[PDB]
């Protein structure tokens, strides 16, 4: 199925940018003075915030790279919800669609 | 064993410029920084810059002059740092450290002794 | 950038006594500070991380605790050994800093 093939995809793509961008906020955050998200682990957790949007705030990129790196961790877990309920929605109206013989 | 060797003595002359290594060993991650840590006789631990060895990029202290440049050797793993333009200002201990990307120097060498006089 | 203060810059003992050496952070740092020690002509050598978190291989008598600006590492039972120079390190806020350190005297 389409559907599931894109969801599952897109949850294994979300993983790597979660590890990927954790690596790569590190990397471009050190160097600027006051920069927070400096070491991996407090970072990765920054990165399941940022892609859930849950909005704690208690971590955050300062720089342009830390800042574009944000957005594609954003974008990557807007993007495989997206996918995810899109999924279910199509999972669930096909197997309606069956229990009226349809 | 020892997991981070460094050169016990350097001699260098008012004006000119020296190279330190740091050649390290033990478990390695491509997620490691070395550090480098000044102490001037009789004082204290003084940050001076870091890299991360799996992909070149430094960063320094800019509250100080800035007399270091960092460079990293992957296939031997060595750690340098490019003193240059020495006055006796800069005659220390110089120590190298590695971080685990996790805030803390596990590890240092043992230091090398720069002395800057003709 | 963040400033660490050490106080006192010396700190006599008596042998067998608890010690406890401060370190002051200019801002709240949560836990993210590390204790070494160095000994003389020796290199710095890591006793404590995230304030109170042990190393393997460091006396069960060092110890850490504190939070957000106020810092200690305590020694249990202090003896000879423990002379040495004590430094606390942040790892809060780029770029990582070091206090000024408190040398450890005893009195014999």
């Known amino acids: 199925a389409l559907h599931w093939r894109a969801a599952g995809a897109a949850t294994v793509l979300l993983v790597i940018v979660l590890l990927a961008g954790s690596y790569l906020a590190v990397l471009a955050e050190r160097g600027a003075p006051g920069a927070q998200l400096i070491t991996y682990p407090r970072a990765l957790w920054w990165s399941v915030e940022t892609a859930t949007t849950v909005g704690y705030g208690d971590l955050y990129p300062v720089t342009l790279w830390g800042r574009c790196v944000a957005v594609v961790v954003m974008v990557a877990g807007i993007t495989s919800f997206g996918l995810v309920t899109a999924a279910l929605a199509t999972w669930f109206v096909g197997r309606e669609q069956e229990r009226r013989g349809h | 064993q020892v997991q981070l060797q460094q050169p016990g003595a350097e001699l260098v002359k008012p004006g000119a410029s020296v190279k330190l290594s740091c050649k390290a060993s033990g478990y390695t991650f491509t997620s490691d920084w070395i550090h480098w840590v000044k102490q001037r006789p009789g004082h204290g631990l003084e940050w001076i810059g870091e890299?991360?060895?799996?992909?070149?990029?430094?960063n320094y202290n800019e509250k100080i002059q800035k007399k270091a440049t960092l460079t990293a050797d992957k296939s031997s793993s060595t750690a340098f740092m490019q003193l240059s333009s020495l006055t006796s200002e800069d005659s220390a201990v110089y120590y190298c450290?590695?971080?685990?990307?996790?805030?803390?120097?596990?590890?240092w060498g043992a230091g090398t002794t720069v002395t800057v006089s003709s | 950038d963040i400033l660490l203060t050490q106080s006192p810059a010396i700190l006599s003992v008596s042998p067998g006594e608890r010690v406890s050496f401060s370190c002051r952070a200019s801002?709240?740092?949560?836990?993210?500070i590390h204790w070494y020690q160095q000994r003389t002509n020796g290199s710095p050598r890591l006793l404590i991380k995230?304030?109170?978190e042990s190393i393997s291989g460091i006396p069960s008598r060092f110890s850490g605790s504190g939070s957000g600006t106020d810092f200690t590492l305590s020694i249990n039972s202090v003896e000879s050994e423990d002379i040495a120079n004590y430094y606390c390190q942040q790892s809060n806020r780029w770029p990582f800093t070091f206090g000024s350190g408190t040398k450890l005297e005893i009195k014999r």
């Open positions: 890299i991360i060895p799996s992909y070149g990029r430094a």
């Open positions: 995230y304030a109170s």
């Open positions: 801002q709240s740092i949560g836990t993210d």
């Open positions: 450290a590695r971080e685990r990307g996790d805030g803390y120097f596990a590890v």
